[PDB]
């Protein structure tokens, strides 16, 4: 379907399969971008379920069980591209030996693609698709992103580094409950709140943690991809619409008569480039997609009518992730509000 | 058969620390989730806070600022310590256990429940 | 923080009738509601986890029903010890919040 996204990530474990994991090192923005094409196309491989297996529940098992994942084009694609070398490199990882960032990357965004888990046993079973058991599908989807999440903290913690993270993509939320896996993922493992380890995936499960997936009547912009819906009350930081898989050009549906910038790419002069919408509908980029160097998408509300404590989540600096590892900020004692005289509006 | 007792001092003066401990018999704290709840006077129940055995907490916003919960897994024992008790902190104080199920988050072992005034 | 109300505040109902306490959460939460019993003098114990999932060491006529903004604790038929103060906590969002507590007492 995309064999462009393919050939972009080959090349990028490439270039970073020999690149050292150190204490600071983040991705970069344009291998952010790379993760992120490779699991939307992934997803857009098979737009809807078989009516003959169609989950009675509504889970997203296109995304999750065996019996979709084998027959995606993309997962094909992308294990035998070049006679398989990414396969081959990917048959040797695991989470206790990862060391450089293309191996991070790699076995990260396979495991995801494939349809597996961390431990082998797969998200969801071929004999529950179509099963009616709740509690079984939701403890599944859930364990699903928590052991993403706990995965990646733990190379972490092992490598002692800090501003790496992939994100667990938006279908592996269904019916999970963002402060349950925040508080099971950091009140089970101390060495998790040190304050040099794992910060953006910190921020990510964080901001999910204060922000429900569905607000009916205190919600303010919505995203939805391939049906894959989510509501946001807040600025969203990048790191968020990274992690969940969400582009800026996606459709956002807006509630309220509020200002939005979205922040759509990185110019010169170290700027960005932000769109201002006021009126209720459906928000439009009519502008052209950026490149995987100069990609941006972040959401800030002007919104004066909210709670200080979540204010810092609209600053530049946090809504925007900087391109430098080491300026990066998580937690309001390190936001800051600067630096506004090199964006520019397109609209 | 676990049983849950708390202890600790049934006055205090206002504007002074508030001591609570609770020693669990007939079971262990190392794999649960422990909780400290209050009810005031006829009026209902609010949430306190919890410790995990590890020694990480959750405490409630509305006096997140003054609470303060410890665990000490050698004597089976888990405290709370609230600090500036003002009138509005009479109650009683149950000690709970939660489910140690697939869900973790409700009370399914409650303490006898020791009535503090200020 | 979800404010837990419940309704009514007391019901006196006869012996070996039907009694419905109804908990209506604030905003949504998705079954993550544990009903609780206290007699005079006792403290909570759990009746119901789920909005509909029943305890060991609860008798079967306790139902559990409804879920997202409307909950429903009913009992098929009342008995004496039955007496009790009911409360209604949610565990979808942070802090942890009880309603006000339905008293019911025999007629």
């Known amino acids: 379907v995309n064999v462009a996204s393919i050939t972009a990530f080959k090349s990028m474990i490439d270039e970073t399969w020999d690149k050292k994991i150190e204490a600071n090192t983040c991705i970069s923005r344009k291998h952010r971008n790379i993760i992120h094409e490779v699991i939307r196309d992934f997803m857009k491989a098979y737009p809807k379920m078989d009516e003959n297996r169609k989950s009675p529940l509504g889970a997203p098992m296109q995304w999750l069980t065996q019996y979709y994942i084998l027959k995606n084009e993309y997962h094909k694609t992308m294990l035998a591209y070049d006679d398989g070398s990414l396969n081959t490199k990917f048959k040797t990882l695991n989470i206790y030996m990862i060391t450089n960032v293309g191996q991070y990357i790699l076995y990260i965004v396979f495991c995801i693609i494939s349809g597996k888990n961390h431990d082998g046993t797969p998200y969801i079973y071929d004999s529950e698709i179509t099963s009616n058991d709740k509690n079984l599908i939701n403890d599944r989807i859930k364990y699903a992103c928590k052991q993403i999440l706990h995965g990646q903290l733990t190379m972490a913690l092992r490598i002692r580094n800090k501003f790496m993270f992939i994100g667990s993509p938006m279908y592996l939320w269904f019916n999970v409950n963002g402060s349950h896996v925040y508080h099971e993922i950091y009140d089970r493992n101390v060495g998790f709140h040190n304050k040099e380890i794992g910060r953006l995936l910190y921020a990510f499960m964080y901001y999910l943690s204060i922000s429900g997936r569905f607000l009916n009547d205190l919600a303010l912009l919505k995203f939805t991809y391939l049906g894959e819906s989510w509501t946001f009350s807040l600025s969203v930081p990048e790191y968020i619409l990274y992690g969940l898989g969400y582009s800026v050009f996606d459709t956002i549906e807006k509630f309220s008569n509020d200002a939005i910038l979205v922040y759509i790419r990185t110019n010169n002069r170290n700027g960005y480039d932000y769109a201002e919408f006021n009126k209720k509908g459906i928000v439009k980029v009519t502008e052209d997609k950026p490149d995987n160097d100069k990609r941006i998408h972040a959401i800030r509300l002007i919104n004066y009518s909210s709670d200080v404590q979540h204010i810092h989540f609209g600053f530049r600096n946090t809504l925007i992730i900087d391109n430098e590892c080491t300026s990066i900020q998580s937690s309001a004692e390190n936001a800051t509000d600067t630096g506004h005289h090199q964006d520019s509006k397109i609209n | 058969q676990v049983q849950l007792q708390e202890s600790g001092p049934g006055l205090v003066k206002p504007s002074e620390t508030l001591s609570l401990t609770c020693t669990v018999s007939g079971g262990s704290i190392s794999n649960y989730y422990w909780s400290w709840i209050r009810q005031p006077p006829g009026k209902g129940l609010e949430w306190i806070g919890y410790?995990?055995?590890?020694?990480?907490?959750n405490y409630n916003p509305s006096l997140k600022s003054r609470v303060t919960i410890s665990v000490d897994t050698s004597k089976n024992q888990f405290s709370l310590k609230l600090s500036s008790v003002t009138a509005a902190d009479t109650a009683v104080y149950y000690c709970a256990r939660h489910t140690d199920s697939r869900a973790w988050y409700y009370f399914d072992y409650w303490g006898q429940g020791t009535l503090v005034t200020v | 923080a979800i404010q837990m109300t419940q309704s009514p505040s007391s019901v006196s109902a006869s012996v070996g009738d039907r009694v419905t306490i109804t908990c209506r959460a604030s905003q949504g939460i998705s079954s993550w509601l544990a009903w609780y019993q206290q007699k005079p003098g006792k403290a909570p114990k759990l009746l119901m986890y789920?909005?509909?999932d029943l305890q060991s060491g609860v008798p079967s006529r306790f139902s559990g029903s409804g879920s997202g903004t409307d909950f429903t604790l009913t009992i098929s038929s009342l008995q004496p010890e039955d007496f009790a103060t009911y409360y209604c906590?949610?565990?979808?969002?942070?802090?942890?919040?009880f309603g006000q507590g339905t008293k019911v007492e025999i007629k």
């Open positions: 410790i995990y055995y590890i020694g990480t907490t």
């Open positions: 789920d909005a509909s």
């Open positions: 906590q949610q565990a979808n969002s942070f802090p942890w919040t």
